[PDB]
Amino acid sequence: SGFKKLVSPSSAVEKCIVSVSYRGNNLNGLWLGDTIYCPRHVLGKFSGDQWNDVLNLANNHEFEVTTQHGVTLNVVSRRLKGAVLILQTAVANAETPKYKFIKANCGDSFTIACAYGGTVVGLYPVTMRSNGTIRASFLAGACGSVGFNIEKGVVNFFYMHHLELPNALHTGTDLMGEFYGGYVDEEVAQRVPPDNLVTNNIVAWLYAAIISVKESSFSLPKWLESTTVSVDDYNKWAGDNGFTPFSTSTAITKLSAITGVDVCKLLRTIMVKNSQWGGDPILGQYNFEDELTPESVFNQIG
Amino acid sequence: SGFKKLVSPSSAVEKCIVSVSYRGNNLNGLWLGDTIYCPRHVLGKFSGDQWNDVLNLANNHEFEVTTQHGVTLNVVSRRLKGAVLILQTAVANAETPKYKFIKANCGDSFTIACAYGGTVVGLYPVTMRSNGTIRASFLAGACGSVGFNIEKGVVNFFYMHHLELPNALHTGTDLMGEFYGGYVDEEVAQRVPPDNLVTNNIVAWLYAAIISVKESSFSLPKWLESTTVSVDDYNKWAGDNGFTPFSTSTAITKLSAITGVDVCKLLRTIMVKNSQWGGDPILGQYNFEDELTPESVFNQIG
Ligand SMILES: *C(=O)[C@H](C[C@@H]1CCNC1=O)NC(=O)[C@H](CC(C)C)NC(=O)[C@@H](NC(=O)C(F)(F)F)C(C)(C)C
Ligand SMILES: *C(=O)[C@H](C[C@@H]1CCNC1=O)NC(=O)[C@H](CC(C)C)NC(=O)[C@@H](NC(=O)C(F)(F)F)C(C)(C)C
């Protein structure tokens, strides 16, 4: 019993994180096969069409790349792909895991390996927000940190960190070099669209709250609405109230079955609680938790 | 910028987690040098003075110990230390880190390496609560999972998982075999004292919020009380209102000096917001976060 936001174990990723520095700019890279992926602003703070000329003038021998075992790696080629710099090394990483480069969708949760100087210093879970940001924890030096999970023995790489926006919002690229949310790696004002609370994850959390209450009180929570709202009617309301649309999933179907509570009561609960939460907390809170996924809640049922 | 509840990276610990089974009981062990530490109920569900006779009846050849890579280990001796079974292996773990066994005090926070079948499947942070429990996420098979952190290249082990109490509360031993909270490894009703909100960690979270509001709005937070309360006055109030006592620490002093905000203004804020929070959130919430430590907040400013 108990529900937590889980982080993936980090050993396979630690074996791929390296330090990449260039003329005083210190970042991190992801070393897979004979290729290092790292943010292109290791070269400096350029914009637009300046990047290809910067790339052509750069020199491989000035990339200072070190492994966590203190081996120096040697760059033999360089290219840009989107906002990611791709550096080829003279020898391959013999500890390359099975992996895939996947784009995270809104509401998908994954683990950040927060790295400084080529060393992972801590991990934490994040959710890709509707507007292409994550709420993370990064300082100067953390760029190149990656977001990942592990599924069926494969490391999925979702994210490489580039940029901190106002209000402690973070963004970056996938491992293809494409920025989430259409941001850019420039120190200029950038529009950030409103964050929409992730309905499917809130639904998971309400089900976790019901399981908690039932497993140790056999009595449905007082805050749970008995009235229902249809999905299309909730989704109409969601578009006007800053929530993502509800969409069915295998995990949500199972959680509704396991608890015996109609998801349409949970949606009506979202609508009521959002308008006026009142004095009844849900798992101790008076605000919605939307970074715990239905799959994670399911996996924590025994 | 941004604040998260961080998890330690797990590679050093993954190299020490093994599976330990005995006559159908399947749990995990921690393999350091030539010694495996695991919960003594791998031998079965006994009580009181029975454990010594059970230990004497056990036979080393019937322990099934396997490493994550599938290597079978051979037990050559056995002894009890509190509720921990200590098994000696014929060969030492060549991947043993530098480590310490430390007992966590109330408010101390650390990482759970959640393991099934000898394999770490996920990590998450926890805080040692005032009643000697942690609020974790465990299923059958998880016993022997360990709580740890890493400081200055040394793995501190704080916790080994044994038992789930009512209301999804978890507890277990330190690596010396002593149960937290005076619980026992028996499937009986046990006395669980109140879980008091952890003042020192709430103070950390309020400094985090102060830091965030300074960075976002160039002002003190609207919710921050201007009056101070003395520590002695606060601590009398805490004992009547389900809070732990405040106590100074190096990290809290550093946060007070960095922000320029007297910690006694934070203590007054706790008293006021606990009695009537109102509609102003703190870092998005209307309830106290008490599992982010002063040390972690300090580390996330640099
Ligand atoms: C990695 O090099 C850092 C990580 C940042 C530093 C503070 N927290 C982080 O996550 N990235 C940068 O310093 C980045 C460099 C660009 C050239 C891509 N700059 C920023 O993130 C800046 N942000 C912006 O200017 C903004 F997004 F437009 F707001 C700051 C001001 C340095 C945070
Ligand atoms: C590891 O072997 C499990 C971990 C448990 C399983 C469910 N979630 C957990 O964290 N521990 C046990 O099964 C343990 C064995 C004892 C002999 C130490 N038993 C329990 O945790 C039981 N708890 C109790 O009887 C209680 F604490 F008194 F409440 C349950 C009922 C199996 C959870």
From Swiss-Prot, chains A, B:
Q: What is this protein called?
A: 3C-like proteinase
| Residues at the catalytic site | H41 (for 3cl-pro activity), C143 (for 3cl-pro activity)
| Sequence ranges assigned to domain Peptidase C30 in this UniProt record | 1-302
Kindly report every residue range on the membrane side named Cytoplasmic. 1-302
Q: Which domain of life is it from?
A: Viruses
Subunit info? Monomer. Homodimer. Only the homodimer shows catalytic activity.
The job of this chain, per UniProt, is described as: Responsible for the majority of cleavages as it cleaves the C-terminus of replicase polyprotein at 11 sites. Recognizes substrates containing the core sequence [ILMVF]-Q-|-[SGACN]. Inhibited by the substrate-analog Cbz-Val-Asn-Ser-Thr-Leu-Gln-CMK.
Where does the record place a coiled coil? none
